[PDB]
Amino acid sequence: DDLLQRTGNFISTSTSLPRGILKMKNCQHANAERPTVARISSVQFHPGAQIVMVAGLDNAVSLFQVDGKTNPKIQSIYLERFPIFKACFSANGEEVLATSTHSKVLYVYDMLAGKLIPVHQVRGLKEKIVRSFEVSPDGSFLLINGIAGYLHLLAMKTKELIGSMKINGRVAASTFSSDSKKVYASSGDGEVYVWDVNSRKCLNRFVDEGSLYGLSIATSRNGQYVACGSNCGVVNIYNQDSCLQETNPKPIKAIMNLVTGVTSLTFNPTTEILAIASEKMKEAVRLVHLPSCTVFSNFPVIKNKNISHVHTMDFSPRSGYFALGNEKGKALMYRLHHYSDF
């Protein structure tokens, strides 16, 4: 009836993530127990456990228990002459796949069975060095970027080649769809191809606007958004249905905040935050509120001068933690107070 003949509140917290201001608190470094001075190439959160995996140009691969206070070390493995270019978990999370700069061998570390299998020879593959690769969300496929614009598709459980897809020009970056049924390939002339998985055919070819050449691409878990980076630092966000049916799609919003070439794109698991980053300039990391397409104004504290160059970011499975790795060997972690689960 009336609220001013009693005492009470008027404003309350919303379920959706608020725009404009992000509530953040810095936590202990991910690699606090294992300090290093080499560049951090990869950081990622385990899908089903509170485990973070940190790999870098230092030949070590490490797994850490994700705790806000100490982050104890679980296990650390050192490879002989294998500077890790990219190390990622499998979709199920049971095994770790890692590769190096200009090395043919691919290393698979089976955690459940305690076996470290080096895959040196893949039958039917003429590629000399394997450095860039992706894993499907469902866990049944693995894709390898090659030369002369070939994409190689490999089964996850057997590591045997299924087929090859050729695009015109170089392959800059590639990713799997949310449903894992399609492949997005970004060419070196700014054009993006859509490939089907079960039958290796090109479904459609659209052109990213005002992009000389792409450096990254990402897709959302709910399948709503597709984000592409370009050389000038412009990030284009599209609806997925637009990319499938239109030769010249019109993006929802072009993120012009970054000024130097975007190299890493990461979508929040709840699809409320997009992280855009550039490794060429210090403090070139931004966070984007996806439904509003407006950038949070308080994340990069330029005064502190800790972030420096950015190479990798990752989100916890329930978006509780945000991780970031720099060139100085520091894997920064922040906690988002809106999300109360890991």
């Binding site: 709910n222 709503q224 699809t271 996806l290 439904p291 509003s292 397409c293």
Partner: protein, 44 residues
């Protein structure tokens, strides 16, 4: 699942042009309310 962005007052150009005009030349409040509440609704 699907995320929908509901319209905001600032993004609508007509409402901003209505709010940038001086008070005395502004039309009756009922018609302003009509356009405002209509623009706040989600169009189909």
């Amino acid at each position: 699942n699907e995320l929908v962005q509901l319209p905001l007052t600032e993004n609508i150009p007509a409402i901003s042009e209505l709010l940038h005009t001086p008070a005395h030349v502004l039309p009756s409040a009922a018609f302003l309310c009509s356009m405002f509440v209509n623009s706040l609704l989600l169009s189909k």
